Structures are given as C-alpha cells and as structure tokens.
Amino acid sequence: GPKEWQENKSWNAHFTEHKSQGVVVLWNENKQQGFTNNLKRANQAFLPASTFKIPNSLIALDLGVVKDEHQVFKWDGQTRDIATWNRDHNLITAMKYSVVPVYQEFARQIGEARMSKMLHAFDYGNEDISGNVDSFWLDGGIRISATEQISFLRKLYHNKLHVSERSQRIVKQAMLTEANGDYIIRAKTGYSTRIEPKIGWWVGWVELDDNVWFFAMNMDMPTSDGLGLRQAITKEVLKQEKIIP
Amino acid sequence: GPKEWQENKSWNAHFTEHKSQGVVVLWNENKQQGFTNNLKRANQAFLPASTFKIPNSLIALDLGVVKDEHQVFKWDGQTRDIATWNRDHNLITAMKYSVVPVYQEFARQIGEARMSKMLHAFDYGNEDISGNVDSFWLDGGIRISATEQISFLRKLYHNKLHVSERSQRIVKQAMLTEANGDYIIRAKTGYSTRIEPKIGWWVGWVELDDNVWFFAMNMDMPTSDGLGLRQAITKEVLKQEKIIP
Ligand SMILES: [Cl-]
C-alpha cells in the first residue's frame, strides 16, 4: 500500500533547469501524505537561519518581550549593509525584511534558560542552542530538517504548540507573504551563510479553500545571486502539482 | 489650522471614466486626516448589504455560534444562482464568496435581542435591526455611511470593539483579500440590490510597512455588470494618491 512519504524525482528538473541543487518537501494535510524529490535531503538537518524567526517570534510574544505586532523596536542607529534594516520595525516588518538585529534583541531578552525550555517544549529540531543566545540559529548548534520544519509548522497551523493561541495567531499573521483569490501563502525565508554548507530556505504553507499544503525547501546557495530561486523553484513545484495556477 | 477632512474632486474623473457615480473615502491613520471626492455622500447612510458580514462574523464568533474559522457550515442542498454558494463553507470561504445563506443562519442563531445589543455596543451605523432577523442588512432598517464604516473599521483594526480580541483577530484574518510585498488589503465587498438606490460597497484598509489607510467606497450599481468597478475605482484612487504602486 501507499507510503507516508512519496519520492517524486521529476521535480529535480526544476533544480537542474536553474543549475542548482536542493529539496522541496510538501505535505497534503487532507490526505495526510507527503511528497519530496529527495527523501534523504528532506531529512537532513541544517541551521535554520532566519526561519528561526518563527519560533523566536512565538517565544517573544508568549513571554511579553513583544507585546503585540504593532510595538515599535527603534533602529539602534548602526548602519548595516541591508538598507531595510536601518529603520524602526514592528514584528510584521521585522519578519518581512528578516531584520536580524531586532530578533537578536528579542533573543537576549528571552535569555538562554527560557529559550532552551521553549525549544524543548516545541520539540524543535535538535533543541540545541549552543553558542550565543543571540546568534545560535546563524552559527551555533541548532539543526532542523525540512520534515522537522513541516512537523513544527503543522502544530503552529493547528494552534497546538505550547504557547497561547494568541501568540500563534499573531505569528501566523506576521508570516503572511502573499494572498490572492487563488491561495494564501504564510511562510518565512532563511539564508544560512556563516557555517558551511551555505543554503537558502523557504518554509511555510499554502492555504486553499478546502485544503492546506505545507512546504519546506532548502537549496545550495554559494552566493546571494540565487536567493530568488527559493520561491521560484517552490512555485514551479506547486504549479506542476496543480496546487496554484 | 489644518483640516481633518478634505474634499478632492479630481477623483471624480475615475468615476466619470467608467460612466459611474459614487464616493471613495480614505483615512490616513498616521496623520489622522481623511479625504473624499464627495463629503456629502461620504456621510450619507445606506444599507450595508454584505459589508454587514464583518459585524455579523464578530457577533457569531463572540457568542460561540461559530467556534472558529475552520468550523464547517454544510451546504443545505438548495441550488442557488451563485455557484460558489452550492458547497460546504467555513468562515474564511463564506466571507470570500459572500455566502448569504450561511450568514442568514448565523443571524437566526444570534437572534434579535443579542443582535441589537451588539450593534448598539459597536455603535454601528444607526444601530437599527428593524425588518427580518435574517435579512435586515439587505432590506431592513439598518443604515451606515462610508465615514461610519471607517470609524467601525478603525476600532476593529485596533481591537477596540467590545467583543474579544480573539474574535477581532479571526475576523481580520477572514477579511484578508490581497497581499504582496507592497501592501496587504483586508476588506469586504457588498451589493445592495433590494431597496433603491442599488449600490456597491467596498470597505476595508490597506496595510503599509509604516502606515494604514482605511477606505470605504460606495457607488451606484444598477446591474451586476459593474461590480468589478468597486475594487478598480478604489485602486485608481489609491494609485493616484501613491498608496499602492
Ligand atoms: Cl492574516
């Protein structure tokens, strides 16, 4: 009979067409079945990089470090390389622009003891925060696979994580990335550059009228020129599978 | 001193271009200033029609008539003219497709006494539910102006309505209409055909990185042929005012 995870290597053509390598993992929530081009890489655990802004936001909100999605975290005045970071932000825009320094401040206020307790409660990856409390998701010990991202995201979708329903609703609002009359995408990008292998991530889900498709993808990212392929390759897979037009 | 409300008749060109008549009202939240092509019509009261699905959703959620945005409202098996109504719905899809029969059932469960009490607590329009308990927003005594729609929507945006924060967050989720890297629109269409003057509505807001623009428009709508002009004319005004690209 059928397997929980089916391997579809035809999606490799989307990576090869773009001279790239990686994995797309999909989970059909109604069917309770998943699909991927590479079962091994789907289960390979990597640094989460800015995809960690999902659990970091949940923890900050539940502890009151972030009061709500409108609270302003003023720019500290240091001019950084990414121009969108050199301004005031709230939770919505800090997630949209992947504003690392805002989330580093959240992490310092959370502190290592509460951060570790929460990640254990979340069953998140290898639950390892070794390194600096304000950078472990970039260059410390935490590792999470694409299938583990999906497991975590499904809990968040269903408000089943061990934080309040309010915290989960606010983070799902902040994850809003695209919406039209055909679908809604709630998702978070990531770009791991500090420790090899350099990779890009996109994790989240596609809401349809009558089903939800969870997704997690990562791909080799030797330079920043390929960052747009995170969404583009995912959408090519979604289009091939008739999930989006 | 500066003016809270300013009339801009140049927006009438967007109505004339489409052989139409109506009013667009905008509110710049940061500046606390409003703008409209027709101050008189902006303040005249009309049937809300399906824009009433906003308060109706809030009341149904707060009373527990609707448990959450996933609860299924099974199709009653009666084939109606609008094809998307002839299927099961949840709160998200019932809003999206403006599924009147689902909301008529909500209104019957809410009942006259609680519906009236809630509309008074919301300061919603003339607060008058005279007429049939399950159609008064289509052919009863309730009336609301475009400026009153904005005032109600601003309360919803700020979680200031008397119902729970949870109920307000769920309805704002269900109002999601469009989202991209430039803006998020949360809104509700309406179409009042049962009592003259027949009009179309679009009410909601545009979320930017650092501001929110509330909007409420109504326009003469003698047939369904022009329904798309509700969004099209609003977007022409938003583009003219540099709110969206
Ligand atoms: Cl949302």
Numbering used by the authors:
A (entry chain B), B (entry chain A): 21 to 265
What did the original publication write about this model?
The OXA-48 carbapenemase is widely disseminated in Enterobacterales, necessitating new treatments for producer strains. OXA-48 is a class D SBL that uses a nucleophilic serine (Ser70) to hydrolyse β-lactams, with a proximal post-translationally carbamylated lysine (Lys73) proposed to act as the general base for both the acylation and deacylation steps of the reaction. Diazabicyclooctane (DBO) inhibitors, including avibactam and nacubactam, act on a wide range of enzymes to overcome β-lactamase-mediated resistance. Here we describe investigations on how avibactam and nacubactam inhibit OXA-48 and two variants, OXA-163 and OXA-405, with deletions in the β5–β6 loop neighbouring the active site that modify activity towards different β-lactam classes.
We determined high-resolution crystal structures of uncomplexed, avibactam- and nacubactam-bound OXA-48, OXA-163 and OXA-405 to investigate how differences in the β5–β6 loop composition relate to DBO potency. To investigate the possibility that the differences between avibactam and nacubactam binding affect the dynamic behaviour of OXA-48, molecular mechanics molecular dynamics (MM MD) was used to simulate uncomplexed, avibactam- and nacubactam-bound OXA-48. In contrast, such differences are less prominent when the avibactam-bound structure is compared with that of uncomplexed OXA-48, although the Arg214 RMSF increases slightly in the former. In contrast, in the avibactam-bound or uncomplexed structures the t-rotamer is preferred. Val120, the other residue contributing to the OXA-48 deacylating water channel, consistently adopts the t-rotamer, as observed in the crystal structures, in all simulations of the uncomplexed and DBO-bound enzyme. Arg214 is considered to contribute to the carbapenemase activity of OXA-48, possibly through its stabilisation of the Ω-loop, modifications to the active site electric field and/or hydration.
